[PDB]
Amino acid sequence: AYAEWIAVKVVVSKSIGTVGIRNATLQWGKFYRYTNKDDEISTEEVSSMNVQAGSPQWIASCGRENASSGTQGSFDCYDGNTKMGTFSWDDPWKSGATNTWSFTPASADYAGITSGGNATGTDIGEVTLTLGRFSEN
């Protein structure tokens, strides 16, 4: 249902400048143009986004309308040709089931720190993903 949704705000550090969103996939649900759940967009459109430092953009997904199912999927973040990592989520419809999400970095050269999100209830809601380039201290 539309009650199951996530919207990921992609924040790119000047340590990277531009992040390519690629390889988006869904096991359940659809992508949409935040904030209008009726405005469905293709996986290819999501997988063509370039996010610039200073101007965050949103990747949003919800369950299919009136269905007893939610949204589950992922997308990859790239710094040019170099994979930074993968953001994944699982927002089930079933009442009482835990909602989950994570960024998994490809290496210690990049980090994706998340803030926000509901582990319980219908929707994950808005989550911020802050991406940067890092070196060991």
Residue numbers in the entry: 2 to 138
Authors' text:
Recombinant RahU protein was expressed using E. coli expression system, purified and subjected to crystallization trials. It is of note that RahU was purified in 20 mM Tris buffer and formed crystals in 0.2 M di-Sodium tartrate, 20% (w/v) PEG 3350. The crystal structure of the apo-RahU was determined at 1.27 Å resolution. The structure shows that RahU is a single domain protein with a distinct β-sandwich architecture that is typical for bacterial and fungal aegerolysins. Furthermore, RahU β-sandwich structure shows structural homology to the superfamily of actinoporins, 20-kDa pore-forming proteins found in sea anemones, with a RMSD value of 2.2 Å when compared to equinatoxin II31 or stycholysin II32. Some of these residues, such as Val20, Ile22, Ile60, Thr72, Phe76, Phe88, Trp90, Asn100 and Trp102, are positioned in the mainly hydrophobic core to maintain the integrity of β-sandwich architecture. However, a majority of the conserved non-alanine and non-glycine residues, including Trp6, Ser16, Asn24, Trp29, Lys31, Lys38, Asp39, Glu41, Ser43, Arg65, Asp77, Asp80, Asp91, Pro93, Trp94, Thr99, Thr101, Ser116, Asn119 and Thr129, is solvent-exposed and/or positioned in the loop areas, possibly providing a uniform environment to aid in the membrane lipid recognition step.
Members of the aegerolysin protein family are acidic proteins of 13–20 kDa, which are mainly found in bacteria and fungi. In this work, we show for the first time that the bacterial aegerolysin RahU from P. aeruginosa interacts specifically with CPE. The crystal structures of RahU revealed the conserved aegerolysin fold as well as a ligand binding cavity, harbouring a Tris molecule from the crystallization solution. The structures of RahU, in the absence and presence of Tris were determined at 1.27 Å and 1.13 Å resolution, respectively, and reveal a typical aegerolysin fold with a central β-sandwich flanked by a loop containing a short α-helix.
